[PDB]
């Protein structure tokens, strides 16, 4: 099996930690959801190819501009996350995260991932956002941002229901192999 490295980036409330936990855990966390993620090496078989995919989180490093880039050496694929319940997390993608990742990870494929897709049809979420003249991120807004930043592709998932989670990591493995 070939070894590849994945790093997830995005704003503090984007759901990156929860996404790594749900993908990596054997059973869904029904008793306690961890605060942090250390690392993990997933055994993935995608399109007949076996890969050892090392997973890393940048949670906690968002305010530390000299510590954060130490997570990037030899990254093979970037998952760039935003939360669908946070239109503001999507706005920081082209201004901050994209130039940073392109600088430290040249030529590395970026998959733009819209997290918490289950909140798009959540009445409490829609009520809260409507007070700030906002609404949950639309699928076309996610695709357009991904197209604009030169992302390898656009994907959505929900860590809460697990929908789309396996597909995200299988596609990230395919991107890392190209």
């Amino acid at each position: 099996a070939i070894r590849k490295k994945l790093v997830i980036v995005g704003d503090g409330a984007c759901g990156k930690t929860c996404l790594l936990i749900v993908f990596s855990k054997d059973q869904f966390p029904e008793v306690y959801v961890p605060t942090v993620f250390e690392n993990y090496v997933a055994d993935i078989e995608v399109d007949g190819k076996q890969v050892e995919l090392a997973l890393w989180d940048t949670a906690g490093q968002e305010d530390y501009d000299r510590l954060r880039p130490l997570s990037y050496p030899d990254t093979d694929v970037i998952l760039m996350c935003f939360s669908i319940d946070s239109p503001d997390s999507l706005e920081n993608i082209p201004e901050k995260w994209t130039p940073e990742v392109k600088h430290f990870c040249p030529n590395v494929p970026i998959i733009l991932v819209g997290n918490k897709k289950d909140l798009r049809n959540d009445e409490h979420t829609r009520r809260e956002l409507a007070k700030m003249k906002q609404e949950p991120v639309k699928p076309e807004e996610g695709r357009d941002m991904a197209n604009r930043i030169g992302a390898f592709g656009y994907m959505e998932c929900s860590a809460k229901t697990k929908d789309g989670v396996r597909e995200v990591f299988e596609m990230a493995t395919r991107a890392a192999l190209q």
Binding site: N39, V41, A59, Q61, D63, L67, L70, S71
Partner: protein, 244 residues
């Protein structure tokens, strides 16, 4: 790690570590606070274990089996002995706090009510200055260590056989040389996330809410100082490149 501590921290949470008849005696808020304190101690035990893999398995193994040029092992594992001393002492204090809190006749039922004071002590005074100095040096030497590793693995057969041998066991799957270095660099930025979540469930005793608020502030000051003191060293960098 030692068997006693591994078994004490084998469960996924504090609520699954204690007896169910003990869990039932506590309010939901106490359980939520204890689950996050348990995660802080469990991840500290794992972090000390990562440092022991670096010092005992890799570093010492290379000195005892390989003929590496002097100053090479130090370049691969900068500050590992100092980091091991800092975190083994901190882990010792966390485990002693848990041990004193055990109910008589039990080796698993406890509640830690006073963590804030231990965190203020760890992240203030000489121990905080030592953490700041050690992480500023470690994180500035991180890129150099990774490049030195890559060079040795690609050009030295005996080094490659040594790495493939000592990393073959399934328990070392997440702990190759480069993985250990990033695990250590990332440890310090996990602390505010854990402390903030403990604080969110520690409002019941005002002295405790105040102590954890002070500790969170000290941890953030340490991180800001380490972040400001980092500049990546590069092997063979010239003075002109540095002062420009």
């Amino acid at each position: 790690s030692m068997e006693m501590d591994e078994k004490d921290f084998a469960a996924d949470s504090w609520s699954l570590a204690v007896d169910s008849s003990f869990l039932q005696q506590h309010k939901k808020e106490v359980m939520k606070q204890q689950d996050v304190i348990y995660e802080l101690i469990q991840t500290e035990l794992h972090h000390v274990r990562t440092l022991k893999i670096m010092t005992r398995l890799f570093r010492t193994g290379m000195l005892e089996e390989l003929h590496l040029e002097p100053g090479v092992v130090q370049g691969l594992f900068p500050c590992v002995d100092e980091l091991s001393d800092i975190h083994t002492r901190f882990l010792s204090q966390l485990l002693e706090r848990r041990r004193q809190a055990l109910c008589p006749g039990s080796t698993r039922n406890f509640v830690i009510h006073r963590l804030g004071d231990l965190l203020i002590s760890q992240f203030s005074g000489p121990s905080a200055e030592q953490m700041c100095k050690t992480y500023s040096e470690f994180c500035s030497r991180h890129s150099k260590a990774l490049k030195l590793y890559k060079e040795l693995y690609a050009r030295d057969k005996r080094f490659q056989q040594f790495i493939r041998k000592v990393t073959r066991p399934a328990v070392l799957k997440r702990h190759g040389v480069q993985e250990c270095i990033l695990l250590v660099t990332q440890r310090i930025t996990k602390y505010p996330l854990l402390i903030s979540r403990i604080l969110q469930h520690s409002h019941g005793i005002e002295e405790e809410r105040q102590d954890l608020t002070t500790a969170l502030g000290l941890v953030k000051e340490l991180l800001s100082n380490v972040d400001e003191g980092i500049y990546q060293l590069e092997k063979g960098a010239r003075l002109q490149e540095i002062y420009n």
